[PDB]
Design a protein around this ligand. Sequence first.
Ligand SMILES: OC[C@H]1O[C@@H]2OC[C@H]3O[C@H](O[C@@H]4[C@@H](O)[C@@H](OC[C@H]5O[C@H](O[C@H]([C@H]2O)[C@@H]1O)[C@H](O)[C@@H](O)[C@@H]5O)O[C@H](CO)[C@H]4O)[C@H](O)[C@@H](O)[C@@H]3O
Ligand SMILES: OC[C@H]1O[C@H](OC[C@H]2O[C@H](O)[C@H](O)[C@@H](O)[C@@H]2O)[C@H](O)[C@@H](O)[C@@H]1O
Ligand SMILES: [Ca+2]
Ligand SMILES: [Cl-]
Ligand SMILES: [Cl-]
Ligand SMILES: [Mg+2]
Ligand SMILES: [Mg+2]
Ligand SMILES: [Mg+2]
Ligand SMILES: [Mg+2]
Ligand SMILES: [Mg+2]
Length: 1060
Amino acid sequence: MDGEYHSPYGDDDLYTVQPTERSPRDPKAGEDVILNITTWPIENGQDVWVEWTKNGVAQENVTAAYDYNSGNNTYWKADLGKFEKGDEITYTTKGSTNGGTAYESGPFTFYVTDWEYVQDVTSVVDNGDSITLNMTATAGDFSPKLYLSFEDLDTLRMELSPTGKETGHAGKSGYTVEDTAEKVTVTTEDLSIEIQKSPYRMEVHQADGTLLTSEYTTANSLGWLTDGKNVINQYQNNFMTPSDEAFYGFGERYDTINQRGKDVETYVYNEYQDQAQTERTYLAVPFFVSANKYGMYVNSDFHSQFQMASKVEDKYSFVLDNDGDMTNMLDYYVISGKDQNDIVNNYTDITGKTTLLPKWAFGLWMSANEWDRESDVSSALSNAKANDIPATGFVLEQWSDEETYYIWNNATYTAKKNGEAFSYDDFTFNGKWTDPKGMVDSVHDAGMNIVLWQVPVLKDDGTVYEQRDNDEEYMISQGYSADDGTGAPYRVPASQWFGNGILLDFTNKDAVDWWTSQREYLLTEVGIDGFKTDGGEMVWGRDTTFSNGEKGQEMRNRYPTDYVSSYFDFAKSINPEAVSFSRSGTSGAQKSGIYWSGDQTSTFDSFQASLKAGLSASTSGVSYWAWDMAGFTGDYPTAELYKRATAMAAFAPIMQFHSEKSDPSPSEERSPWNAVARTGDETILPTFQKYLYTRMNLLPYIYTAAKDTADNGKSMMRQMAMDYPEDVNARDLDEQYMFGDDLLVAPIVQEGQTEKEVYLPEGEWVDIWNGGVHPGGETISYYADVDTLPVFAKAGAIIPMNMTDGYQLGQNVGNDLKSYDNLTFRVYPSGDSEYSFYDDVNGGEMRDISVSEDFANEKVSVDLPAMADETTMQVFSTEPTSVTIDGADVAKADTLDAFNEATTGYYYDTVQNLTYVKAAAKDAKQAIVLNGVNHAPYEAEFGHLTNVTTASDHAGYTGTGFVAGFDAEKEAVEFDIDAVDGASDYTMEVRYSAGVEDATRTVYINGKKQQITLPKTANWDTWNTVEVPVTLQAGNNQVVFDFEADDTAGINFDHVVIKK
Ligand SMILES: OC[C@H]1O[C@@H]2OC[C@H]3O[C@H](O[C@@H]4[C@@H](O)[C@@H](OC[C@H]5O[C@H](O[C@H]([C@H]2O)[C@@H]1O)[C@H](O)[C@@H](O)[C@@H]5O)O[C@H](CO)[C@H]4O)[C@H](O)[C@@H](O)[C@@H]3O
Ligand SMILES: OC[C@H]1O[C@H](OC[C@H]2O[C@H](O)[C@H](O)[C@@H](O)[C@@H]2O)[C@H](O)[C@@H](O)[C@@H]1O
Ligand SMILES: [Ca+2]
Ligand SMILES: [Cl-]
Ligand SMILES: [Cl-]
Ligand SMILES: [Mg+2]
Ligand SMILES: [Mg+2]
Ligand SMILES: [Mg+2]
Ligand SMILES: [Mg+2]
Ligand SMILES: [Mg+2]
């Protein structure tokens, strides 16, 4: 016998076990305890046994029996039997061959547990800023205490002390209590908390009485798992949930946006590519938002399992782990708010606000693992320029020596001792990187910023490399690693990524200062702009111990955020414009930069999953989210996937392309120029350009939304139910979302699809590309070829943009971040709307713009505040008869060139139905009024057409053309028309041409028929308007124009306008 081995918890992995563990790891009462033991080599005459005590009394030895052999080893099972709650078992496993050398493992101790639950509230003590509920338990001899406090008047905090020896924290005092013999009610202006005393049971209501959530119907819902003497290993609570409740968030989730029916694990993990299928994630957060208008946050870094109607149909539960410490209270919050986004804001009050990033973060980020030398970088920059791709972000991954990870590849130097930091001058730069500072300089010269890839582990694959060995030596001697629980440094389990490597203990300030000081020259001298801090999901083992005294169970989820946050703050301390780009974290991750969805494939299935990950991450407070556009590996994406992915990426929080392969032939770059090369489809380039340029045109709206995230907790990209939680059609949507406050984006995420369903909530929605109007409250069908993305503006939207003199979306404005070309505000008038623009170009002043729609009196008014730049309003309406600024008429410009050369004026874009109004910069409010205007036209060519087509051969039409002829039976044009101001009579203007003879058409208004006369126009190049009286009602009015048997003559139908 060369050895024996048993270790009850193995690596403490949630998904797998080592072959020498105890099962169950933590025995409960009535569970059979099995010890898996190994001996080597495989040899006859081996004896394996267990020496042990139960409650301090020696037991008869238990003999192990063989299980199987594998490799050089024999595996055995020793059966200890079942135990009762309270039993303390201590054991040593032993092996020997023929009475000789006994080898052993242990001693190991476990305490047998069982569940104890809250029974009744015996007394209530109101301390003014906290309330204590003294309770009885269903079993055992504890005297538990549940403390209630208010983090705010709409945010309830519960802290449970099973033994009653701990005390909860103070909160707000603005509550009242109505305590009676059978019940206690705690009320604030936002919540009503009703608590039955016997048995204890809590219901959380809004002040108006509406139920938010409640503990399970049978009570005894709240519990702890204990042996009654030494340990508390888990906590649980159970709640009632009706069949229709939807549950969002839980960190970044790849399988579904609605976790109803799932057992959700709060456990960070590095799962390569099949995150959806395994239901795993790098970024896990114990916070969810329910469409029933509340969120719940379990405040603990230990692993938890959320059982969302996965066991019993009307029950959800959380089971939270603990390390045994009986003084650790259960601490969770039930979070209300003014709306769903305010619930997220309240959550970030507790766990941390998003840190506003510099504007460069919101441009295109270019990346490819294959970029591994200076010539690759100069080529990327030249290709970007040759293809008119003004990106703002650049990433290097394969930049280092691949040993120390803070030294440029090929650099030579005099190896240092004692972890002393190098300076740029210490190195002689060779081969792939002859001048790193110059390389960096060239990136900045192109208007981009660079980040370098990092890991939180000191590599140790057993190979010899002088400087790495020097650092490992120093790190261990300073106690800069975490401890394995025996005085030795913690190493990542062997079979994992960076197996055998030593983690830097990021809880240890001195260790962090040392680790970062090795990277300092990169920021102070080389001039980088941040780090792509990869990995973090590397803490295994229960006995793993950190300088803060916490161990592995508690630190696994926290470690990656301690790591990311440590680098983020460090980089920023030296360079205020620095940005981190990471993948792993837990609650609080949002404070430290960008999170991307990790490693996926270039397929539509993966694209769908990526969108689910961004939507769930959003609800969980991680707003600055990215993904590898079109996937980073697998067979190269098809032109169709690359085009569909580019569209979505451009209308996402962070836009970034990337690829896995280190030295492929041909190139695996997910760049647009390489995509053209690989697919042979040259049309990819102008489509990518269109989207990238549109994003840059929208950068003012995007960056303002980025600031709203930081200040008010509203994520940039949001699942539909975050804005419409009561809308039954919005609950499960995962192929569209809101972007900023006012844009609805509906990416085509299915292969071969061109008929896109888009669910439109209540109100009016306008296609931002062409001015097509879509009343809300139904699912429409939008024809989207491979180059097209449905995007719609909400009623009342005010959207800042940076336009060229062309003034259309999709025109290249460049990547200048320090000035605007033509600062423009796109407006869709609807009642009174306001917007606060973040003018970062001019010191970050908030510009409060308001708009007052008054179509009933043919007017739209804009109150423009003082600005530092010339402004152009683009207002969706019919053509004005006049426009005033401060009561003085501004000049009408007949052409766009004339509009551009003017200092002030107005111009009507006939194709887009937009009135441009130009105002000069002034240190004073300016009152703009558009007179004689009506709601924009409903274009006939955008209507639902039956057996009739469009044309554009006779000039003077609005929109893109008109419906041509429309002169045969069963030919029809149907509009979806909104009442401008509620149910009422209105005048409908019908614009047409009838160059040959008088005509008539039949019109149906919500089923009510009338015939209209359309007299002859001078010729087909002459348009006329006819006014028809209609009665419209609230919502969507179906207005169908038909050519019936008694109708006559051909016309060209331009549009209809609704007015008073
Ligand atoms: O050759 C010139 C002529 O060609 C097309 O039609 C010939 C069409 O003429 C007479 O009928 C038309 C009918 O089709 C419809 O026309 C509307 C259409 O008019 C112009 O285009 C016609 C073509 O249809 C063109 O002049 C115009 O440019 C276009 O924009 C309009 O949509 O309705 C008119 C009025 O009732 C009718 O006169 C003729 O009766 C028929 O035999 C012949 O096929
Ligand atoms: O939102 C309106 C409309 O947008 C697209 O169609 C625009 C398209 O409509 C007609 O075919 C005109 O003749 C063209 O000039 C326009 O480009 C969507 O495909 C459609 O579904 C949507 O309703
Ligand atoms: Ca038209
Ligand atoms: Cl007209
Ligand atoms: Cl009517
Ligand atoms: Mg699906
Ligand atoms: Mg609040
Ligand atoms: Mg290369
Ligand atoms: Mg700098
Ligand atoms: Mg009004």
